[PDB]
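ok posting inputs for the protoporphyrin IX containing FE job
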Amino acid sequence: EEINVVRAAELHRRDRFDPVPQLRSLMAEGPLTTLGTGRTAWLATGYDEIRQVLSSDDFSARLLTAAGITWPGFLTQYDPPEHTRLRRMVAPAFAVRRMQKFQPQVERVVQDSLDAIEALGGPVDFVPRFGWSVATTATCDFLGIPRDDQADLARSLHASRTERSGKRRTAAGNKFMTYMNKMTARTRRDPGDDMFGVVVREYGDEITDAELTGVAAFVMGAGADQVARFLAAGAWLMADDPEQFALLREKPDTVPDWLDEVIRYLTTDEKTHPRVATDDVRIGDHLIKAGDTVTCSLLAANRRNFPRPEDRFDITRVRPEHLAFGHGIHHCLGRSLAELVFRTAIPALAHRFPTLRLAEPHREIRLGPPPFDVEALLLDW
Amino acid sequence: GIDPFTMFEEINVVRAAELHRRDRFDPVPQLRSLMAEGPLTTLGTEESPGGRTAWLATGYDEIRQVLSSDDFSARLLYGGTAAGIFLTQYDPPEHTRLRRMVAPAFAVRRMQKFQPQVERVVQDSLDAIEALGGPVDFVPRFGWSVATTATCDFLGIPRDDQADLARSLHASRTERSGKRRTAAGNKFMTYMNKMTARTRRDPGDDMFGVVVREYGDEITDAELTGVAAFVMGAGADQVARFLAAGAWLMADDPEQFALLREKPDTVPDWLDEVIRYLTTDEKTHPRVATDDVRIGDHLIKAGDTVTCSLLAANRRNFPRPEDRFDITRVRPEHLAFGHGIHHCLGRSLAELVFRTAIPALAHRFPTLRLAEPHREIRLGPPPFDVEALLLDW
Ligand code: HEM
Ligand code: HEM
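and the output
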């Protein structure tokens, strides 16, 4: 049953922004297909069926010991009621009011990230200078990491995930986590105006150091990876189809749902973590036996009408429907922060470089392994 | 979010734990298969240039090589994990410096002196079981009763205090509520801080007084407290789980333990065989490679991790006849207490408790049996955790 998680990864590659032919074949086969098999690994590609799976109380997101021991603060490895307690304690850091009040700082992050790019001059790689820069600075600011330490903290996170020397990965992972631990200690003594502080002032000794460090490490990792990769993919979409984003730039009021369409089209997290069934559960016409796993294809759901015309990127589309942030109890806790950064950074780029385009538009943009990972994006203006 | 499969240390801890579940007393088929493959196999690899590999060592000699090598670190793994937040987290020189100061408390002469007290603890626990009447759960009534009392006596906690103090320590590590964790932790700490202050005024006969006499200045209060908490928490857990699994083995194979009770001098190494067969701590903490090392027919790169299967080493000939429990086996070999600089500090205490309590049980209840012979015994997550053991006699 473990090879079936490798198999899922293969189906979520991309032909530029499009899903690959292998996935399309499964999509047209039906809403729910077998990946492998008396236990069965299923892929859910139907919009309705995915929602049924992700919102059912007869599935667990657990791999298998209590989540808190090996995965403290890694929410998508908790089941209720432990999941419910921990998510309740961190959720107020992501409430609408705190997100609105964060918006001015996120605006400055994008403006300064754009001030650096213009000074450097075209052409220039937007993967590090726009994607990575905005994402890590915004996420560090949200956590209250002092500005003087962010560059080195962000460098150690990146090195821990990508370094070509395994030895240097270990050292960087240790550097990163020690810093997150020290942040937890400073909050416990003197809670500030940030995620750490908000959690500790509301709950205090109810949340443990392991939980708090765990959640903070997760938010840093999610913020740095998810937001950076999305912003890189957004800049590429801007370069590829600039007339649609000129409409955003000049007449944003006529396209109030624009961000949902970009999210739908790009789908930079293509699939959810496998869910294991705990009762026999009818899902559509299909029977999922207790012990089966179901992986949900968020790409399949959001791009369900590919390759027909209506699936093509249309920024004026009325109320775009997507499941890009999942569904049910594990739906993305960070959605409001991610969306704030995208709402701010994407139009800030359009206003700043209306004449944005690919430097070297002859050659293909190289993509890494999924999830959707633009490795370099050389743009001029 | 974050894909849990990209969490290198955590995902491979999980995979290693799954491999060290048990089918009654035996290794599961999945570990058996890896054992047959060779002395070292992969748990998993990060899929990128520079990606690290998590390895499982199952070969006896290869495990001794890994664990005696200076090119592996215990500290560097848990420092890259949110899960990693006493002695096993240290490398030399910190490891050496702390371990030398506490080692005198676990010396041979010290265990000889404690033996009469351990005999009394066993007899008291067995009297209480007898007074309850069958069927009795041997997990709380034999395993934990003996483990808690013997470990607290070793620390010199007065009998009146032991129940409350052990409860406090367990609360602080256990509860979901983090408020009750801090309250219980502070109750434990305030007691130990007084005990430390008392010891430093006049060193006594227990663990604290021995240490403070030989190394009083050079060891801190926090270090003393930390060692006590390990002995009372994790140490006691290890001992309780072993005694519960021992009692199960005795009920399961009464004829071999009848040999222990009637002709104990014919089976001088009996305890080494019981320990080998049961292997109630199935694996070591994962170590990070700090240099490249060739082991088996593989190259472990610096930054790769290795987890050693003590179960695999101890049960290396499973399922052949020679691996079966045989209390008369001459000089049984095992690595149940690890190897190299991190080898069990409490081995001699653990063995004294087992050497005393197991014969005591065999003599008291020669008719010991499962209460519900056909009902399966439920095992918790690794390490070897008998959840309930209803015995009668
Ligand atoms: C600062 C940015 C982000 C943070 C802090 C964040 C945080 C989280 C957290 C904590 C969860 C787990 C919630 C739970 O289990 O209860 C989660 C789940 C999820 N996030 Fe995010 N996230 C971020 C950005 C993104 C982005 C940009 C996407 C997609 C484009 C995304 C997609 C998801 C999905 C699909 C899940 C559900 C996973 C599943 O059910 O298996 N996240 N996120
Ligand atoms: C009163 C009982 C016990 C105490 C106080 C105790 C104490 C300790 C301590 C302090 C260490 C760390 C040593 C270091 O890093 O230098 C250790 C390691 C170890 N102990 Fe124990 N122990 C006890 C019982 C047991 C039992 C019953 C077993 C097995 C059946 C066991 C197996 C181990 C193993 C395998 C290690 C090494 C782990 C590794 O290298 O990663 N111990 N013990």
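notes: The interface with chain A takes residues 1-7, 10-11, 13-14, 17-18, 47-52, 76, 79-85, 176-179, 181-182, 288, 290, 301-304, 381 of chain B (CB under 8 Å). Residues 20 and 86 of chain B are 23 Å apart (CA to CA).
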